[PDB]
Amino acid sequence: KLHHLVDDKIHARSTGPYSMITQQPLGGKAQFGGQRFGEMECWAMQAYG
């Protein structure tokens, strides 16, 4: 049984903490944070239109 259990991985956020200098949502499961909607995903949804 490997140490990659689901309870350590599942995560969700509707509204939580916010970063300080920039006002983005924070990062990581220790906080709530969101998932980085990075550059490549921006390309993907530009490609869909």
Partner: protein
């Protein structure tokens, strides 16, 4: 390159030849004569004299010669400023700023000065230059400005704690330092708390240079989203419930708790704008409060608290 302005300055100040007590006496006499000359020229300028040409011309010569001598002595002792300032680097301010502040202290030392006491310039100036460098390093060093009395007691605490750390081997306790400095332990703790250096939000908390502290600081003052909407809903529900009250009752409540302008009116004002006595206002107040305590219009607003 020669980008080191330290060098660009030292090679500059190594020019003017170094002087002696003999030339110092001559220079100081010239400076004082010039300052006196300009003082008298200002005095005789006002309501005064159509001066003789030779007299006026050469007293202006003295006035300018005094400044020449002053600047000459300043250039002479720039090197002394450097020699005294080198020892206060490695911490706080930078070398160049220290040299400039020490120069200011030197202007003060040559200004507020005497030569009839018969002393080499450095003896007296050294004191001033050291004082000026220390004054600057105290005020314009720490980001949050802490004043000089507090700075000196901070330094005394630091020295005592450090020396007694080595003496004891173990770190001194707050009562040991409080007894040593003849101050109170809470003051020891306060000073220690004031020695804390504001960390930089610019630091690679991760090994590679991509993770900065400023990107992990929850701002515990932001709009909670649900809190704001909840407050709006509370406003609405409370407004409705108060509208259940009678006109006198609604008015007394709104004015008593400032729901109409944000100004909390008190009993005398409310009785004045309604033209009754404040006891009547307080009775209507108590009656209304008791009515609202009734579960019918109460349980609706309980959750907001």
């Amino acid at each position: 390159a020669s980008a080191d302005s330290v060098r660009a300055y030292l090679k500059q100040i190594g020019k003017v030849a170094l002087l002696n007590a003999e030339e110092e006496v001559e220079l100081a006499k010239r400076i004082e004569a010039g300052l006196y000359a300009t003082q008298l020229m200002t005095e005789l300028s006002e309501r005064g004299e159509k001066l003789p040409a030779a007299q006026r011309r050469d007293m202006m010569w003295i006035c300018r010669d005094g400044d020449r001598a002053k600047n000459h002595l300043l250039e002479a002792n720039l090197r002394l400023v450097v020699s005294l300032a080198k020892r206060y680097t490695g911490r706080g301010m930078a070398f160049l700023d220290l040299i400039q502040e020490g120069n200011l202290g030197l202007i003060r030392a040559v200004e507020k000065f005497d030569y009839t006491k018969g002393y080499k310039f450095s003896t007296y100036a050294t004191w001033w230059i050291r004082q000026a460098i220390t004054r600057a390093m105290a005020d314009q060093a720490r980001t949050i400005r802490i004043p000089v009395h507090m700075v000196e007691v901070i330094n005394k605490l630091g020295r005592i704690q450090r020396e007694l750390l080595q003496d004891l081997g173990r770190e001194p306790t707050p009562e040991e330092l409080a007894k040593e400095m003849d101050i109170t332990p809470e003051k020891v703790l306060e000073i220690q708390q004031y020695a804390r250096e504001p960390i930089s939000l610019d630091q690679t908390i991760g090994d590679e240079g991509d993770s900065q502290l400023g990107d992990f600081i929850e701002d515990s003052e932001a709009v909670v989203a649900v809190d704001a909407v909840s407050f709006t809903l509370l406003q609405d529900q409370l407004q409705s419930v108060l509208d259940t009250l009678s006109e006198r009752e609604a008015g007394v409540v709104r004015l008593r708790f400032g729901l109409t302008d944000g100004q909390p009116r008190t009993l005398d004002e409310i009785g004045q704008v309604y033209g009754v006595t404040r006891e009547r206002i307080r009775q209507i107040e108590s009656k209304t409060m008791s009515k609202l305590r009734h579960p019918s219009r109460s349980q609706v607003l309980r959750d907001y608290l």
